[PDB]
Design a protein around this ligand. Structure first.
Ligand SMILES: CN1CCC(c2ccc(-c3ccc4ncn([C@@H](C(=O)Nc5nccs5)c5ccccc5)c(=O)c4c3F)cc2)CC1
Ligand SMILES: Nc1ncnc2c1ncn2[C@@H]1O[C@H](COP(=O)(O)OP(=O)(O)NP(=O)(O)O)[C@@H](O)[C@H]1O
Ligand SMILES: [Mg+2]
Length: 292
């Protein structure tokens, strides 16, 4: 259990390049230098923005042991931690980056088979987190990492502000449940189907709470048939108990992924690279050897 989180010494890893930043910290590409070795192993390091006292460090550690204990092909795992004045967290480095950047940079080359499978895989990861009594609380395309173009994994979940991803009851009452996570999942699917559009673009965050109670929702993505948009809309129902369950969303997107051209309308979809077996084996042997 506690063997799943490696406590690292400052002297055995090095930050080498900034990857990006978010609400809680800054992510670096870094290098692990095993003691007694000459090799340098790439890692991703998140340094927390606010220095902490050893008293808050107990809380951070308590949670780190949980994030190091997840084991599902579609959920990322915490690997290590270094408790400096500002805490540094270590996980596997995903050279392809997050799914949001991936769909933005490939807006004109992503076919429906990929999009629907990503939706399946994200739902699978969220379903595993629910089975483990874990609520994500910040699900968005930016917190889905691309291991290979064929394999995405959820990151940066937790235990107990992105207003535009949050369920209405989260905005108003600080209520976060698995059903509010289903709301955020709906927005994430919308980001993918719009190839990374900003949700409610230009609407001030102060006024999102109002327009949701008045019944507006994110618009139907241009490539979406009504069958797909109906799923997104059910995720944004005000009564949290009416939203689909992750178990149901897996089944639904798996059905659609068996005939992706019936449910997503993409120009050039017939010419788009579909995940070939030869390409799948190659990718897995170089970057992705886990069971899946
Ligand atoms: C009340 N006060 C104010 C601030 C409080 C606070 C409490 C807890 C934590 C905390 C603890 C453990 C964590 N464990 C992992 N992670 C993810 C992660 O490291 N991401 C990465 N990206 C790249 C490299 S590492 C991650 C990675 C993989 C799967 C899930 C989650 C965390 O963010 C994480 C975490 F923020 C931070 C701050 C403490 C005191
Ligand atoms: N393990 C990783 N490998 C590669 N890139 C990563 C990894 N983890 C995070 N990133 C990237 O690091 C950048 C910042 O991530 P992070 O600091 O978690 O913020 P965010 O998730 O983008 N925003 P926020 O939700 O507010 O925290 C993004 O470009 C991520 O895609
Ligand atoms: Mg993140």
């Amino acid at each position: 259990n506690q063997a799943l989180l490696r406590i690292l010494k400052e002297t055995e890893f090095k930050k080498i390049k900034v990857l990006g930043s978010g609400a809680f910290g800054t992510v670096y590409k870094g290098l692990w230098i095993p003691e007694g070795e000459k090799v340098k192993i790439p890692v991703a390091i998140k340094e927390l923005r606010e220095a902490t006292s050893p008293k808050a460090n107990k809380e951070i550690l308590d949670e780190a042991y949980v994030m190091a204990s997840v084991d599902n092909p579609h959920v990322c795992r915490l690997l290590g931690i270094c408790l400096t004045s500002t805490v540094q967290l270590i996980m596997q480095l995903m050279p392809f980056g997050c799914l949001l950047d991936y769909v933005r940079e490939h807006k004109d080359n992503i076919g429906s088979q990929y999009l629907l499978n990503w939706c399946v895989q994200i739902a699978k990861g969220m379903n595993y987190l629910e089975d483990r009594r874990l609520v994500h609380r910040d699900l968005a395309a930016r917190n889905v990492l691309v291991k290979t173009p064929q394999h995405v994994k959820i990151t940066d979940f937790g235990l107990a502000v992105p207003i535009k991803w949050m369920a209405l009851e989260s905005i108003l009452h600080r209520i976060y449940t698995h059903q509010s996570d289903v709301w955020s999942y709906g927005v994430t699917v919308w980001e993918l189907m719009t190839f990374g559009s900003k949700p409610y673009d230009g609407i001030p965050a102060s006024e999102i709470s109002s327009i949701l109670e008045k019944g507006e929702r994110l618009p139907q993505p241009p490539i979406c048939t009504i069958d797909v948009y109906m799923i997104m809309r059910k995720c944004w129902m005000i009564d949290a108990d009416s939203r689909p369950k992750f178990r149901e969303l897996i089944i639904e997107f798996s059905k659609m992924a068996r005939d992706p051209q019936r449910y997503l309308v993409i120009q050039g979809d017939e010419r788009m690279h579909l995940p070939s077996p030869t390409d799948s084996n190659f990718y897995r042997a170089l970057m992705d050897e886990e069971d899946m």
